[PDB]
Amino acid sequence: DFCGAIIPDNFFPIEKLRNYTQMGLIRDFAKGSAVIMPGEEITSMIFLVEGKIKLDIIFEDGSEKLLYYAGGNSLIGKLYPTGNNIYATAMEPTRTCWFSEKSLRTVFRTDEDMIFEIFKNYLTKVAYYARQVAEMNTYNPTIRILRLFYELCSSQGKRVGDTYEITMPLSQKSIGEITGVHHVTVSRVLACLKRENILDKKKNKIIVYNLGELKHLSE
Amino acid sequence: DFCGAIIPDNFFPIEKLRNYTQMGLIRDFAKGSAVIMPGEEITSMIFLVEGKIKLDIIFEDGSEKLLYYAGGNSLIGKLYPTGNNIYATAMEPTRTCWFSEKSLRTVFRTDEDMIFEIFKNYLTKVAYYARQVAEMNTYNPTIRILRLFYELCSSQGKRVGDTYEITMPLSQKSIGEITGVHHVTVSRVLACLKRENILDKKKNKIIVYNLGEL
Ligand SMILES: O=C(O)Cc1ccc(O)c(Cl)c1
Ligand SMILES: O=C(O)Cc1ccc(O)c(Cl)c1
Ligand SMILES: O=C(O)Cc1ccc(O)c(Cl)c1
C-alpha cells in the first residue's frame, strides 16, 4: 500500500497490468527514440512492459528538466491534457502498452482492483513532487543531498558486516538532477562523506560506514 | 478534462461526488480545527462538501510548508500512507465526506465515471508539483514571480481596454508560499512592477498595464 518514493525512478510499479495488455495497444521504441515527442498531446496511460524511459519537462524557452525514470511495470499517467510539454525517450529497446480511457473502462470492468493500483501510482507521484517542492524551500543544497542518502540507507540499506550497502547505481549526474544541486557541490559533498568515512558513493553501490553520523550531519 | 493548474488552490473539483456522499462518512469541522492532525495516518479520500482547508506538510524538525488550499468539491487523495506528515486545517466551518477504499468500491460499482474524475484530480496534482520542481531548478525566485503573473494573465486575464485585469484575491503572503520566495523579495519585486507601470497587485484585483513587457 505504501505510496512513498525517495527517488523519481520506478514509481509504484503495477506488474498486474501485464494481464490486460491485449486491451491496449502495443507500441515499441528503439533506443534513443521519442515515446512522447515534444508538443505531442498524449491521452493514454502508457504502461512500460519492458525497457527504460527518461521523461522530461520542457519549458517555453526550450529549457529541459528530468521528471522521472521509468522501467518495467511503470505507468505513465498522462491520460488527459495537462498544459506541460513532456519529452519521453527510450533509453533502451522498450515495449509499451498504451491504454485509452475506453480501454481502461474495459480493464476496470474485468478487474476492479486495477483502479486502486493506479490510484497508488498517482498518489506516489503527488507525494514525491509535493514533498520535493517543500524540501527545496526548506533545506539547502548540501542538506538535501545528505537527507537523500540518509533516507535511501534508512529505506534500502542492507546490513553487510559493520556497514549498510545500498545496492544501486546512482551517478553524480542523477543526484544532481534529483536534488537540483549543481555538479561541483555534488562532487564536494560526496568527496567529504568519503574522506570523513561516512559513505562511499561508488559506481554500482553506496556503502554507508556510519549511518548515525550521516543522520546527524543531515540534521 | 483539462488537468492544468497555475495556483495550488481548488485543484480539479469533482462536483459530482456530491451524489455519493451517503456512501462515505460525513465529518464536520469548526474553524481552526484539524481535518488532518499532524502525525495522523489517513487512509481515506476526503471530499470537501463546503468550506475551506489549508493543507500543509510538516518535516521531522517541525518546519512546515503549504501544499495547497481546498474549497467546495475539492478532493484530498490520501487513500494510502505516503510517508509525509500532513496537517490540514478548516479555515472556516467545513463539511467533509471521508471515503474509505471500501466505500470507493461501492461508489465505482454504482458510477464508473467517478474513477476518471479522480484520475483527473490526481493528474492535475502531479502536473502541478512536477512542473514546480523543474521550474525551481530552472528559474531564479524573481523570474518565478514574473512567470506566475504572466501565466495568470494569459489564462484568466480579461482584456479590458488598454490594460489586462485578473479578478482574484492573491495576497503577497500567498504569492511567496506558491513561488517559494521570501517576503522581502516578493515586496521588492512587486513594488518594482507597479513603479515601472507593469503590474498592480491591489487587494482584490491585478492590473497588468503591459503584458508584452511581462
Ligand atoms: O523489447 C521487446 O519486448 C521487443 C522490442 C521492442 C522494441 C524494440 O526497438 C526492439 Cl528491438 C524489440
Ligand atoms: O504530463 C504531465 O504534465 C505530468 C506527468 C508526467 C508523467 C506522469 O506519469 C504523470 Cl502522472 C504526470
Ligand atoms: O499525503 C501526501 O503525502 C501528499 C498529498 C496530500 C494531499 C493530497 O490530496 C494528495 Cl493526492 C497527496
Residue numbers in the entry:
A (entry chain B): 9 to 227
B (entry chain A): 9 to 222
Provide the authors' own sentences about this structure as they appear in the paper.
The transcriptional regulator CprK from Desulfitobacterium spp. induces expression of halorespiratory genes upon binding of o-chlorophenol ligands and is reversibly inactivated by oxygen through disulphide bond formation. The CprK associated with the o-chlorophenolacetic acid (OCPA) reductive dehalogenase (CprAB) from D. dehalogenans and the closely related D. hafniense has been shown to bind OCPA with μM affinity leading to sequence-specific DNA-binding, and ultimately transcriptional activation of the associated cpr gene cluster. Members of this family are homodimeric and contain an N-terminal sensor domain linked via a long α-helix (involved in formation of the dimer interface) to the C-terminal helix–turn–helix (HTH) DNA-binding domain. We here present crystal structures of the oxidized ligand-free (3.2 Å) and reduced ligand-free (2.0 Å), OCPA-bound (1.8 Å) and DNA-bound (1.8 Å) D. hafniense CprK in addition to an intermediate OCPA-bound structure obtained by soaking ligand-free crystals (2.0 Å).
In order to avoid formation of the inactive, oxidized CprK under aerobic conditions, the CprKC200S mutant was used to obtain structural insights into the reduced CprK structure. CprKC200S:OCPA crystals were analysed both in the presence and in the absence of glycerol cryoprotectant. This resulted in minor differences in crystal packing. Comparison of the individual monomers within the asymmetric unit of both crystal forms does not reveal significant structural differences for the entire β-barrel and associated α-helices of the N-terminal sensor domain (residues Asp-17 to Val-141). Moreover, a comparison of the available individual CprKC200S:OCPA monomers reveals an identical conformation for the N-terminus, with the exact position of the different DNA-binding C-terminal domains only influenced to a minor degree by crystal packing. In contrast to the marked asymmetry of the oxidized CprK:OCPA structure, near-perfect twofold symmetry relates the monomer structures within a single CprKC200S:OCPA dimer. This arrangement places both HTH domains in a position compatible with binding to the palindromic (de)halobox DNA.
